[PDB]
Write a protein that binds this ligand. Structure first.
Ligand SMILES: *CC(=O)N1CCN(S(=O)(=O)c2c(F)cccc2F)CC1
Ligand SMILES: *CC(=O)N1CCN(S(=O)(=O)c2c(F)cccc2F)CC1
Lengths: 304, 304
């Protein structure tokens, strides 16, 4: 029993983190096989960052200008290329600690662990969601760029995020490991505002199921609703629309608790309309939306 | 910017987790040098658990009854002893991944990371505090016993907790790595109630400082207070008394923000008396108390 915001064990990803230095800019790189992946803005002077032309900036960089350090040993860079907003640095040594890995581009609402690093050294691990506006609400100081977000499936690390940007509002933006930004964000020190940070409805419901499973039942009510009726209330409260796809996904939790998805929807409807009235669910005074249905099943079943 | 509930990177501790089996009971062990530490209740039939006599139960166990598995390789047990509520299993192989380590007994209010394991395999990592009633609010299913809590100081893992018990109320109890329970708890399936789960006042203040540092300032007020005046309000709200020791500890955050500790106390006083009024601080609708002042400084400075 008990339910916690839980990150994947970070060891497999700690084994991949290196320091990348280009001139006076130091950030983090991900070392998989003989490639080091890092944000392309490593080549910028914070003056370049106002309107960088990356292809033009990169012409001035040779392999030997990229200083790659794994622990206290230098890696020899034998190649470099730009893919979208990341640099791939070919090194002469395969990372001996390379885990089984995939690159995946996640959807909004999908959760992942972040290993926050500075100078290629891990500081901490935390759980995130890709927000519906394609920002993440991270913890990233200067030097944290190139820190990565991941899921683990037993022994296979799926890398879904590399950190690039803090928006003026202190939310975060980054790329998949093909260098493609989540959302409309660009690696330029310019005015970039996030859209509406809506609540991930299906995640909230997952977490209400986690609550029932863990004995927090006070908010269960006598009501049901319909997707269309629920969705009117959701819209009004800046909750994402709920689809039959989300209902299907919640089916296993529905089964385990014997609470119909639409009944739990009706419960969530009353919490939105009535508020918590100073009560808590799983030690939270607000509705948590950074647990996916898969996260809830995982932590409630104890997958390793 | 941004502030997250952040666990230590778990890699150093993943390298220490083994499976311990005694008869039909499987749980987790911590492998440091040539010793495997695990809960002594590994020797119990859940029938033994009602009123176990551990010294008597242990007489019936030989080295070869303790099955220790690190990955998919068996360790040879060449010795076993009981220290308080843990077994020390001497094995013939030093853990080659043994990190620099200490055993520390933490005080209530102190935070640590837990690496939740099942069958010696990591499932997840999360951040905890030792509650003032010497429980922790964990996420632990059957098989999780012997999962450990730790702090890291650069390269030195301080182990402070091993998981043993879920109380009937679904809160958690365990030992330091000398086998001594935190609080008055015993490894027996009996009526054990926790005392008052009071709020860790100094941690709440730390987290209010983290909020100001990260731009969440709305709750800063025009008032100050005194320790004695603050403490009357704290008592009324089941907050731990604040000492000059806690004020001293908050000094660095006081300095960085230019907010006197007692001013921040007066802010916390108004939040207790007035509530949040539907507002959030660092994405929370309640006052977070599982960040220590050291945690706030660490994450706000980016220590690795
Ligand atoms: C995002 C990231 O981690 N980095 C890119 C920016 N640089 S930097 O330009 O060197 C820099 C500092 F070193 C300190 C403060 C601001 C700043 F932009 C850091 C690495
Ligand atoms: C605390 C812990 O992880 N364990 C001790 C109890 N045992 S058990 O007695 O084998 C057991 C199960 F295997 C399943 C359900 C309940 C139960 F007590 C599990 C390991």
């Amino acid at each position: 029993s008990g339910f916690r915001k839980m990150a994947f064990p970070s060891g497999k990803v700690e084994g991949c983190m290196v320091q990348v230095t280009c001139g006076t800019t130091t950030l983090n790189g991900l070392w998989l096989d003989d490639v080091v992946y890092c944000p392309r803005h490593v080549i910028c002077t914070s003056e370049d960052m106002l309107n960088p032309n990356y292809e033009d900036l990169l012409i001035r960089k040779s392999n030997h200008n990229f200083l790659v350090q794994a622990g206290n040993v230098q890696l020899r860079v034998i190649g470099h290329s730009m893919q979208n907003c990341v640099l791939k640095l070919k090194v002469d040594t395969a990372n001996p600690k390379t885990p089984k890995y995939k690159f995946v581009r996640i959807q909004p609402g999908q959760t992942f662990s972040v290993l926050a690093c500075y100078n290629g050294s891990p500081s901490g691990v935390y759980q995130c969601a890709m927000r519906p506006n394609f920002t993440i609400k991270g913890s990233f100081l200067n030097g944290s760029c190139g820190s990565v977000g991941f899921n683990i499936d037993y022994d296979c690390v799926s890398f879904c995020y590399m950190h690039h940007m803090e928006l003026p509002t202190g939310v975060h933006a980054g790329t998949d490991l093909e260098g493609n930004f989540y959302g409309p964000f660009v690696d330029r020190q310019t005015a970039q505002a996030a859209g509406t940070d809506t609540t991930i409805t299906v995640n909230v419901l997952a977490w209400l199921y986690a609550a029932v499973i863990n004995g927090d039942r006070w908010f269960l009510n006598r009501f049901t609703t319909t997707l269309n009726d629920f969705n009117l209330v959701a819209m009004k409260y800046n909750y994402e629309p709920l689809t039959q796809d989300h209902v299907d996904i919640l089916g296993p939790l529905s089964a385990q608790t014997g609470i119909a998805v639409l009944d739990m929807c009706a419960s969530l409807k009353e919490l939105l309309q009535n508020g918590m009235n100073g009560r808590t669910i799983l030690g939270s005074a607000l509705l948590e939306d950074e647990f996916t249905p898969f996260d809830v099943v995982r932590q409630c079943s104890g997958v390793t």
